[PDB]
Amino acid sequence: PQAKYRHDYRAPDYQITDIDLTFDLDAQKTVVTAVSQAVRHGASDAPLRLNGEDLKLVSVHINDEPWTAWKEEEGALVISNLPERFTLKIINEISPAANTALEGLYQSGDALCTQCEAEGFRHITYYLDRPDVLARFTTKIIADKIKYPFLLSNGNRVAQGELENGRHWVQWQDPFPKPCYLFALVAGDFDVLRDTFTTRSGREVALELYVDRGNLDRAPWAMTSLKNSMKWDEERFGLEYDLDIYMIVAVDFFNMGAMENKGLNIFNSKYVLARTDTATDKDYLDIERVIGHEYFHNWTGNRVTCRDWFQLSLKEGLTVFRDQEFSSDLGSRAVNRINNVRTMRGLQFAEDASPMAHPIRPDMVIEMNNFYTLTVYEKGAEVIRMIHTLLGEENFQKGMQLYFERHDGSAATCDDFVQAMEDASNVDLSHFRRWYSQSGTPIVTVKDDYNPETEQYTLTISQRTPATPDQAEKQPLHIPFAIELYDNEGKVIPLQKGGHPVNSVLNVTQAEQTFVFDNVYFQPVPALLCEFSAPVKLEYKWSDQQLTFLMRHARNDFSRWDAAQSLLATYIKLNVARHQQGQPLSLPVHVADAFRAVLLDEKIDPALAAEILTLPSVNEMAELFDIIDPIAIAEVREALTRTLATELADELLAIYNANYQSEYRVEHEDIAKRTLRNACLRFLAFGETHLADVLVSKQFHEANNMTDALAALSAAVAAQLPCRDALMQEYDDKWHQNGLVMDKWFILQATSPAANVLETVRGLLQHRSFTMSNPNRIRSLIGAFAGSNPAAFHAEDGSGYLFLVEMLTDLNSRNPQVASRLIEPLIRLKRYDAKRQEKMRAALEQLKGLENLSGDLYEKITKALA
Ligand SMILES: N[C@H](CC(=O)O)Cc1c[nH]c2ccccc12
Ligand code: NA
Ligand code: NA
Ligand code: NA
Ligand code: NA
Ligand code: NA
Ligand code: NA
Ligand code: NA
Ligand SMILES: [Zn+2]
C-alpha cells in the first residue's frame, strides 16, 4: 500500500456537477446505476480516473454510447478520449451481505445502511471519491416493500411509486452540492419518533429519529438533544438549519460514533438510545455531545467541506470545539474543561509521542481511516480554542462569519480558516499556523523571581518540542500562556508594567523570553497555563503549599482541580519508585488534609469536588514517566485509593449520605451530587471490607437508575468485594439480551483487577451477548482489555500480547478499521521496559506476516517497527 502526500494535492482533471443514482436493493446483490454529468478541466489526453473497490462493473456509457476506450486497474476505472462535457453512465453490482468491514453499503441487523467517510463511496460505485468534487445528488431506491418499508436518502422526498412483485420505490433530492463522503442510504423497518423544530427565522423543520422496532421509549432524550443543538447553534454561532427535514437513524453495527451525512445522520445506537434504567449520566451527556457534534457539522463540514483529507481537522477540530462549547454552555464549563484536559494529557499526549505521531494537518497518509485521531480531533480543538483565546469571542465570531462568507458551498483548507480568522480579527496568525504543521507536545519551562526592592515579578519562560518519530525538525510555537498572580490573602494581583495594564494571556513566541510585572506588592503564588490555555506540558517547581493554596483560592475551578493534579503527580511518581523497591505507600499528611478540606468545604461545587476526588487514570499517570511500569502504576493507584479511604473514612461516609437523592433527574445539579456521591462510594469500597460490601450491595439493589447501579457494580469489581460475583451474575441475567447494556459489563470484566482476568476475557468470547461481528461488543471486551487494563495486557509473560495478536488475526480480515483501533496499545512498545518491548515487537512481527495484511494495520505496524 502506497503513501499519499499533502504536497501532491492538485485540482482534479474532471469535475462532476450532478449525479443521479438508482439502487435496486437486495442484501445479496444490489445493482447501482449512476448517471453523472461531468466536465473535463484538464488536457484531452488526461483520462478520467474513477475510484472503485470491490465493484462488479456491468456497463459504461458516455452520452448513451457504450464506451470502448477504458480499462480497469487496481482500484480504478480509467476512461479515455472524452469530450469536454458529457454524461457518464455506470452500472455495477455490490453485495451488502458480504460487507463485514462496514464501509460502503452494508447490513446492520435486517437494515441496509451506508458509511462513506472517508473513502467508502468508491465501494458503492465508480466515482471521483475525493471531497473537492461536489455534486448535486438525486437518489432513487427500489426495494421489497415488506423487508424495507422505509427507504431513506439525503434531502427531500420528491417521488414515490409502487411496482409489481411487492416492490416499491422512493426518490430523494438533496439540493446542496456535496462531496460523496456525505452520501447516505438507509433501508429497513423502524419505529419513528417525529417532532418539529422552528428556526429563529421561522422555518419549520421536521425531525425524524429512526430506531429499531420497540425502541421508541429510548428516543426522546436524543430528540431533545437535537432540538437543544439547533437552538444553541442559533444562539451562539447565528447558524440555522438549511433543509426542511432532519433525519437520524440509530444502527447497532457502526465502526465509529456517528456520521454527519447531509440531512440523514447515521448514528451508532450507543449515542442515541437512553432510558434511566439502561443509561448512566455519562451516557446521557455523551448522547447530547454526539448529537450536537453531528448537528454542528452541518455548517462546519457540510456547508463548508474539506479540499482533501489532509485537511480533516478543518472540520473535526472546529466541530469538536463546537461540541465542547455546547456541552460547556449547557452544563458545567469547569467539568467539561477538566474532562477534556484529562483526555488531552492522558491519551493525546501519548499519541503525540508514539510512532503514529502526526501534526493536526498530516503531511503523509497511507490509510486515511487511521487519521480519525485524538490528535486531529482533540488537539485540533485545542488549536481552535487557542485561536479563540487569542481573538476573544467577538473577533472569533467575526472570523466564523468571514469563513462562511468566503467558503460556503465549497471545499476549503485549514489555511483558509486561519486566514479568515486573521483577516476578520486583525490578529496576526502567521506564526500560529505552525501548530498545524508541527507534531509533538511542547514542553514549557517557567522560572520566576520576586524582587522585593522593586516590587517586580519576573517570569522566564522557555519552550522546546522534542523530536518525534515523524519529524526531526522542530521550531518554537505561538503559545498563548495565561497567568494569574495571587497575594497572601488569595486575591488577584493586577498585572501591569510601567504604569499600564498587561493582558494576562502572554504571547510565548520565542525559545526563551522574559516577562516583567510591576507593582507586585507581595510575593505571589502564580496560577500558570490557566484553563489549559495551550496544549503543552508545564515544568515549574511548585511547592506543595503553593498547590494547596491554589486549591483553596484560585478563581477558576479548573485551576483548583489542576493544582490538585500537580499535588498528586509528585506523590504518584514517588510511590511508583517505592513500589519498584517493594516498599509500601508513603504520603505526607498535608496531602490527605487537602482532600479532606475539599470533602468538607460547604461552598465548593459538588461537581468540582467530585473531579478533585477522581484520581488520575492509569493513562494519565503513565504520561508522568519516561518508561512506563503498568503494574506499579495500577498498584499505586489502588494503594492511594486505600490510603485515602482509610484516612478520610468518616468524611467520605458523611458526604456519601449527604448527597443521597431520592428522585433521578438528568439535570446538572443532580448529576454533580450523584457524581460526588459515587466518587465517595468508590473510595469507601476500598475501606473496611464489611462496611464496603454492605454499602455496595445495597446501592446496587436499591438504585433506581443505571448510574448508581453501575457505580456500585464497578466498585465491587474494582475492590474485589465479596458481593462481586452475585452482582455480576444478576446483571447478566437481567440484561443479556441488551447489547448496549452488556457493553458496560464486558468493560468491567475486561478491566477487572482479578488475577485470572485474561482467562475470563477469553471465556467471554463465547458469551451469549458477545459477537465478533459487532464493533461495540469488540471494543467493550477486547478493546477495553488491551487499552484499559494495562496491568493485565502487559502481563510479564506476554499473554496479553498473544491474545491481542489472535484477535487481530481475525479482525484484520473481518473489519480492519476496528483492528486498527485495537492495535494501538501494541504500537506503544517504546514506552515500556526492554523485555516487554521484545515481546511486543515479536507480536507486531507476527502480524506483519499475515496474509492479506490490511493497509490500516500495515501503516501502524511499519511505523511501530521502524
Ligand atoms: N465524520 C465522522 C465522525 C464524526 O462526526 O466526526 C467520521 C466517521 C464516521 N464513521 C467512520 C468510519 C471510518 C472513517 C471515518 C468515520
Ligand atoms: Na449528455
Ligand atoms: Na463538482
Ligand atoms: Na455552563
Ligand atoms: Na475530550
Ligand atoms: Na478586531
Ligand atoms: Na507536586
Ligand atoms: Na497516557
Ligand atoms: Zn466530526
Side-chain angles (χ1 to χ4, degrees), residues 584-655:
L585 195 96
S586 175
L587 189 72
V589 72
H590 64 258
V591 174
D593 283 343
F595 291 83
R596 190 184 333 265
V598 173
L599 270 175
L600 298 177
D601 184 332
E602 308 216 311
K603 296 175 170 157
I604 197 175
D605 184 336
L608 172 70
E611 294 306 327
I612 293 168
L613 296 158
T614 296
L615 296 181
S617 68
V618 297
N619 302 120
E620 288 168 276
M621 289 182 176
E623 192 57 28
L624 298 170
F625 297 100
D626 296 315
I627 296 303
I628 301 171
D629 184 340
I631 301 180
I633 288 168
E635 295 202 323
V636 162
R637 196 175 191 268
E638 186 176 324
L640 200 44
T641 302
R642 287 184 189 283
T643 299
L644 291 169
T646 303
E647 296 291 299
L648 304 178
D650 298 321
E651 293 89 342
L652 287 166
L653 181 65
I655 301 307

Side-chain angles (χ1 to χ4, degrees), residues 260 293 297 316 377:
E260 67 265 29
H293 185 93
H297 269 308
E316 301 304 345
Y377 282 65

Side-chain angles (χ1 to χ4, degrees), residues 281-409:
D281 293 329
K282 179 146 190 300
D283 298 327
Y284 281 93
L285 300 173
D286 281 345
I287 288 156
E288 178 176 80
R289 85 187 85 252
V290 172
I291 290 277
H293 185 93
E294 310 309 329
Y295 183 75
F296 304 145
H297 269 308
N298 190 53
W299 283 89
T300 56
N302 298 5
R303 284 287 287 258
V304 181
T305 191
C306 296
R307 189 192 72 179
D308 61 66
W309 292 118
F310 306 100
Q311 320 299 318
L312 178 63
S313 201
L314 172 68
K315 67 185 185 74
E316 301 304 345
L318 183 47
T319 307
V320 173
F321 175 75
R322 286 156 48 67
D323 81 60
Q324 295 180 358
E325 293 300 293
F326 170 62
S327 292
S328 297
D329 278 351
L330 274 54
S332 176
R333 177 170 288 280
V335 172
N336 282 277
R337 190 69 186 132
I338 292 166
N339 279 302
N340 299 321
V341 174
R342 285 181 197 283
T343 291
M344 281 295 298
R345 288 174 177 163
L347 297 172
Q348 193 277 328
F349 283 12
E351 179 171 71
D352 243 342
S354 82
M356 274 288 302
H358 49 285
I360 67 165
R361 179 185 64 205
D363 287 329
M364 177 183 62
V365 155
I366 292 166
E367 165 57 51
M368 189 60 209
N369 292 349
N370 288 337
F371 290 82
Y372 286 79
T373 51
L374 293 157
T375 295
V376 165
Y377 282 65
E378 317 298 350
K379 179 171 171 179
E382 300 295 306
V383 170
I384 300 300
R385 184 176 305 278
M386 284 188 284
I387 295 171
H388 187 274
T389 294
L390 292 173
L391 268 61
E393 175 77 6
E394 185 190 321
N395 277 331
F396 185 88
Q397 291 304 333
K398 293 183 203 143
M400 296 295 301
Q401 293 166 15
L402 182 58
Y403 174 63
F404 292 128
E405 177 165 36
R406 295 180 170 163
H407 307 290
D408 185 12

Side-chain angles (χ1 to χ4, degrees), residues 498-610:
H500 296 303
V502 164
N503 196 274
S504 72
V505 184
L506 307 186
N507 295 292
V508 173
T509 59
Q510 308 187 32
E512 184 174 292
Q513 54 252 282
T514 292
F515 301 84
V516 182
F517 304 87
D518 292 326
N519 288 271
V520 183
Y521 55 83
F522 201 88
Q523 182 168 319
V525 178
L528 297 175
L529 199 77
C530 298
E531 257 232 340
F532 192 64
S533 71
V536 304
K537 290 169 188 259
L538 175 60
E539 293 178 337
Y540 177 80
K541 199 172 141 174
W542 293 110
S543 77
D544 289 1
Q545 290 63 42
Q546 285 176 316
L547 292 170
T548 56
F549 176 104
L550 289 176
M551 289 175 60
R552 182 175 167 209
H553 292 297
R555 279 206 300 207
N556 203 287
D557 285 352
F558 172 87
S559 298
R560 304 172 77 182
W561 171 82
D562 196 28
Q565 301 313 293
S566 283
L567 182 67
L568 286 172
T570 302
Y571 302 107
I572 293 157
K573 289 160 82 186
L574 171 71
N575 286 292
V576 163
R578 292 174 60 85
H579 185 276
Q580 293 177 324
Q581 294 312 321
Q583 299 172 269
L585 195 96
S586 175
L587 189 72
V589 72
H590 64 258
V591 174
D593 283 343
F595 291 83
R596 190 184 333 265
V598 173
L599 270 175
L600 298 177
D601 184 332
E602 308 216 311
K603 296 175 170 157
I604 197 175
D605 184 336
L608 172 70

Side-chain angles (χ1 to χ4, degrees), residues 166-185:
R167 292 179 91 62
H168 70 139
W169 68 271
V170 184
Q171 191 178 40
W172 296 89
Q173 175 197 76
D174 174 0
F176 288 99
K178 57 171 176 290
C180 63
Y181 74 88
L182 290 171
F183 175 77
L185 180 151

